[PDB]
Amino acid sequence: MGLVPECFITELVERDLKEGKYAKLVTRFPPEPNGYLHIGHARSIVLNFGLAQDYGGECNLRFDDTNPETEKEEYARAIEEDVRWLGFRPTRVLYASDYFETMYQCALVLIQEGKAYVDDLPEEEMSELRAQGKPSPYRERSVEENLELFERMRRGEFPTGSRVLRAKIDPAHPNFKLRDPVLYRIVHAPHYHVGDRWVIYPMYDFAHPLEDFIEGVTHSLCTLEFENNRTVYDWVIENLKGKCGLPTSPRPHQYEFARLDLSHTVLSKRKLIKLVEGGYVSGWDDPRLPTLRGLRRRGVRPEAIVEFVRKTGISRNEAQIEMDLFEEVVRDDLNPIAPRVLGVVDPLKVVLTNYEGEEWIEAPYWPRDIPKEGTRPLPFSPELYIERTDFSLNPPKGWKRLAPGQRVRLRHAYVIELEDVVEEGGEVRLLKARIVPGTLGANPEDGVRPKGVIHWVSARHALPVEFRLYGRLFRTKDPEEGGDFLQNLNPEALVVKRGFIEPSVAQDPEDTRYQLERLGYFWRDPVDSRPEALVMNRIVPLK
């Protein structure tokens, strides 16, 4: 019933809602349109948009776009597309750059109130002074000179980086971040949304609260990196309430949840850019990646992603999440909705000496535990392919599959036993085998049942598939902090096998998610699969 599970945040909202602190609840999701979103961002998406719906409130999608150098509209697009794919419906699609004129008016007021000033000092010198707790020489400049200099910065008289505007708070403040933090910088560079209008851009610490305030956000939800940043957030709110058309009340407040860190995966933009550019991975939608794009392409359903996020909870509890966990939620999400078909990944041929012609078998798509009914014609014939790995000349103790004195059950059809093994070049190339005569939907006459069941497909009927077998992207549980990050890659992240799958798949809609028995879950890769050249990704293996 509650999309977001119980925690400090639900409680806090519920309290303030009931006590009339705010009329409606207003969250935002605010990413930077300068990259693609990943599984970590999903936590912020489910949280922020989830509360809006859980409590009959609003949630804005807003591109926090104050860094013109890197930011592109295609990232804005991609962001909106992944947000909706997760199933969420932003109340508004907003861009912080539409706020600039208001933010600039706000800076004027700061300066008229003697609350900001222009700093001519170079960057290196400014941080030595901050480190020393000393004031800029320029700090006690006048309202008049500051407005003229700020205007001269607006005009783009000064080059990129050369002057900045800073609030006047306390140069010796114990919170280092309150030492006259920077409000405005100079970048002679055009913005993807608003163009060549501005040469002065605000810093995060100043624009973010103001975007919040402007939108009447009630609960601005951020991850825990903004711990010491909270004090400046309040400072901007408090010195500007009821100014330049801002409300005097109510006002937004920050609250902090733990960012997701998932085992076996890196989420930092730096490292991700590394992997794409250096061709370690094929592209931003690569199913090896934890981008939302890549998880989509992989076959993961948005419902598993939401559920994953929901399942794991919202807290201050920055404990790393095990990939085991994620994999199990995918498996669980696909269990009742993935019809079971049969395909072969490492094909090995088996010829049946005591069988001729064809015959077609009603086979169930759903196992006993799944309430769905559904059936399909499964072709059988004297030539099949089985997994190479379901055959031993030298089987171990447990061996439940096919061997030189061990019968086996072909799933949904006959028991066969081995008769001859043709070898060529040391390794095995074709099985010669026999059906045990009355074993279609029945045991052998002699009572010695087959120890196990293996999957198979008719070599006379089956479709070629390119299988893209995905694993975790790293071997080590902790790649994101571990030292050599590229030395921890899993060489098995992608194996590509050429294989076979039963012909029925051809009569299914392209977006079907299948369970290949004893193999894992699978679906047509949305980019490269074609009906005449099938390509299927393994979404996840079995438990």
Ligand SMILES: Nc1ncnc2c1ncn2[C@@H]1O[C@H](COP(=O)(O)OP(=O)(O)OP(=O)(O)O)[C@@H](O)[C@H]1O
């Ligand atoms: N792994 C994660 N788990 C939870 N939230 C995240 C994660 N990564 C990013 N977010 C949050 O989603 C929002 C937008 O993400 P985006 O990456 O554009 O912002 P950002 O400026 O890179 O944030 P950060 O610098 O904290 O990663 C931010 O609130 C951000 O902290």
Ligand SMILES: [Cl-]
């Ligand atoms: Cl049928």
Ligand SMILES: [Cl-]
């Ligand atoms: Cl069976």
Ligand SMILES: [Cs+]
């Ligand atoms: Cs940031």
Ligand SMILES: [Cs+]
């Ligand atoms: Cs069933």
Ligand SMILES: [Mg+2]
């Ligand atoms: Mg960042």
Ligand SMILES: [Mg+2]
């Ligand atoms: Mg980022």
